[PDB]
Design a protein around this nucleic acid. Sequence first.
DNA 1: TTGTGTTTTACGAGGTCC
DNA 2: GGACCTCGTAAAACACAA
Length: 61
Amino acid sequence: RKKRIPYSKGQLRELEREYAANKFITKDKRRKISAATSLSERQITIWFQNRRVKEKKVLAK
DNA sequence: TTGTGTTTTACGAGGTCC
DNA sequence: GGACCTCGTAAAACACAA
């Protein structure tokens, strides 16, 4: 399930970089992420969802 | 070098919008 | 009729006090 495989350094750099661009992934960007990073379109979608969860948690507060 | 507590992937139950 | 969302959740992997 199915089953957790941590993302690499260069991958996360690409992810967090285009996340800093704006919180929500566009269809266009997801293509070129998926190529540059070798993750599936679904993974990126899920990661972006999980990124915003983490950002919400920053409300300590 | 270990626990054990927090972070990181990955999903299914609910939802909006179209 | 799917594409995508915030969310609770599990569980591997992480990051520290010891």
